[PDB]
Design an enzyme around this catalytic site. Structure first.
Site, PDB file in Angstrom:
ATOM      1  N   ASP A  65       5.725   9.037 -17.610  1.00  0.00           N
ATOM      2  CA  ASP A  65       7.013   9.116 -16.923  1.00  0.00           C
ATOM      3  C   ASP A  65       7.474   7.706 -16.561  1.00  0.00           C
ATOM      4  O   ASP A  65       7.327   7.229 -15.416  1.00  0.00           O
ATOM      5  CB  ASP A  65       6.893   9.993 -15.684  1.00  0.00           C
ATOM      6  CG  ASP A  65       8.239  10.457 -15.166  1.00  0.00           C
ATOM      7  OD1 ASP A  65       9.244  10.280 -15.876  1.00  0.00           O
ATOM      8  OD2 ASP A  65       8.285  11.031 -14.052  1.00  0.00           O
TER       9      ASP A  65
ATOM     10  N   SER B 163      12.540   9.617  -6.997  1.00  0.00           N
ATOM     11  CA  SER B 163      11.960   9.380  -8.318  1.00  0.00           C
ATOM     12  C   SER B 163      12.447   8.084  -8.929  1.00  0.00           C
ATOM     13  O   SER B 163      13.587   7.684  -8.721  1.00  0.00           O
ATOM     14  CB  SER B 163      12.348  10.513  -9.252  1.00  0.00           C
ATOM     15  OG  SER B 163      11.617  11.656  -8.897  1.00  0.00           O
TER      16      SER B 163
ATOM     17  N   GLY C 170      14.923  12.825  -5.097  1.00  0.00           N
ATOM     18  CA  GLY C 170      15.809  11.671  -5.015  1.00  0.00           C
ATOM     19  C   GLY C 170      15.095  10.326  -4.937  1.00  0.00           C
ATOM     20  O   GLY C 170      15.737   9.291  -5.145  1.00  0.00           O
TER      21      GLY C 170
ATOM     22  N   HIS D 131      11.936  11.007 -16.524  1.00  0.00           N
ATOM     23  CA  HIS D 131      12.426  12.343 -16.154  1.00  0.00           C
ATOM     24  C   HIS D 131      13.802  12.290 -15.513  1.00  0.00           C
ATOM     25  O   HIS D 131      14.535  13.281 -15.516  1.00  0.00           O
ATOM     26  CB  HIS D 131      11.413  13.123 -15.303  1.00  0.00           C
ATOM     27  CG  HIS D 131      11.517  12.869 -13.836  1.00  0.00           C
ATOM     28  ND1 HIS D 131      10.593  12.115 -13.149  1.00  0.00           N
ATOM     29  CD2 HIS D 131      12.397  13.325 -12.913  1.00  0.00           C
ATOM     30  CE1 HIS D 131      10.910  12.097 -11.867  1.00  0.00           C
ATOM     31  NE2 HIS D 131      12.000  12.828 -11.697  1.00  0.00           N
TER      32      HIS D 131
HETATM   33  N1  LIG Z   1       5.690  13.953  -2.950  1.00  0.00           N
HETATM   34  C1  LIG Z   1       6.692  13.895  -3.789  1.00  0.00           C
HETATM   35  N2  LIG Z   1       7.739  14.736  -3.778  1.00  0.00           N
HETATM   36  C2  LIG Z   1       8.633  14.413  -4.740  1.00  0.00           C
HETATM   37  C3  LIG Z   1       9.794  14.991  -5.055  1.00  0.00           C
HETATM   38  C4  LIG Z   1      10.471  14.524  -6.126  1.00  0.00           C
HETATM   39  C5  LIG Z   1      10.000  13.478  -6.826  1.00  0.00           C
HETATM   40  C6  LIG Z   1       8.852  12.870  -6.523  1.00  0.00           C
HETATM   41  C7  LIG Z   1       8.174  13.370  -5.495  1.00  0.00           C
HETATM   42  S1  LIG Z   1       6.715  12.791  -5.057  1.00  0.00           S
END
Ligand SMILES: Nc1nc2ccccc2s1
Length: 246
Positions: free
Chosen positions: A96, A197, A195, A46
């Site tokens: 993903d 990810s 951020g 993603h």
């Molecule tokens: N709890 C999580 N919030 C986020 C936000 C963006 C990406 C992943 C995650 S996992």
């Protein structure tokens, strides 16, 4: 990372910082990733799907700070950007997972050092039991309401949640599949955020630090009954093995 603690790259030396160059020349942070072999970084599809061209990207290893150089860091171009062909998005991102083959301007891959090391993959369908504490690492937001990302790398600890618990309607219902893993703090006070990810969820599996998950999605951050959701690496080993010979 909401909550947790500041860290440096010595405490997560497989962590890869991935940036994109814009037309005009400005460079911005994209996502994290993990070095799984000298030439391969694993991350989340993603992060790249809107800009799938490998030439757009820069990968750093051995870097502890977002917008300043860390002594000893290495900079790489992306020789190949491999996205999972069964990727889909509805909140939930399915499949993903992404691979970046890295190559320096001199034609070399990662050279291991105090600040640059690989992380082991799990054996297939082998994950820690629910309730196990694992670590997550990244440059993502420190508060959901923040505009800026932290300049210094962060990490925190979250606990694995069973699929049974994560599938409850009051959690995520059917959005979570068996190829995903949920993790959260018992007080919901620390979590991954925007951020983070693509970065590593690391657990100790029989004495070995193991890449159990890849930060993927979640509703908000550090919210009650809304865990972080992670790509379950142990369910993608054949995909990883095939594509790392590319
Ligand atoms: N709890 C999580 N919030 C986020 C936000 C963006 C990406 C992943 C995650 S996992």
């Amino acid at each position: 990372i909401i909550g947790g603690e500041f860290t440096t790259i010595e405490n997560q030396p497989w962590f890869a910082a991935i940036y994109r160059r814009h037309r005009g020349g400005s460079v911005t942070y994209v996502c994290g990733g993990s070095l799984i072999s000298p030439c391969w970084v694993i991350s989340a599809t993603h992060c790249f799907i809107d800009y799938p061209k490998k030439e757009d990207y820069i990968v750093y290893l051995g870097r502890s700070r977002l917008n300043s150089n860390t002594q000893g860091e290495m900079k790489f171009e992306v020789e190949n950007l491999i996205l999972h062909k069964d990727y889909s998005a509805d909140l939930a991102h399915h499949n993903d997972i992404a691979l970046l083959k890295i190559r320096s301007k001199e034609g070399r891959c990662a050279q291991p050092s105090r600040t640059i090391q690989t992380i082991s993959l799990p054996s297939m369908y082998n994950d820690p039991q629910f309730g196990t504490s694992c670590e997550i690492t990244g440059f993502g937001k420190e508060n959901s309401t923040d505009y800026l990302y932290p300049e210094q790398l962060k990490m925190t600890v979250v606990k694995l949640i069973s699929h049974r618990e994560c599938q409850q309607p009051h959690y995520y219902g059917s959005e979570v599949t068996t190829k995903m893993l949920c993790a959260a703090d018992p007080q919901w006070k620390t979590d991954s955020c925007q951020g983070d990810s693509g970065g590593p969820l690391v657990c100790s599996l029989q004495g070995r630090m193991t890449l159990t998950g890849i930060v993927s999605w979640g509703r908000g951050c550090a919210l009650k009954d809304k865990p972080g959701v992670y790509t379950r690496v142990s369910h993608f080993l054949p995909w990883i093995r095939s594509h790392t010979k590319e």
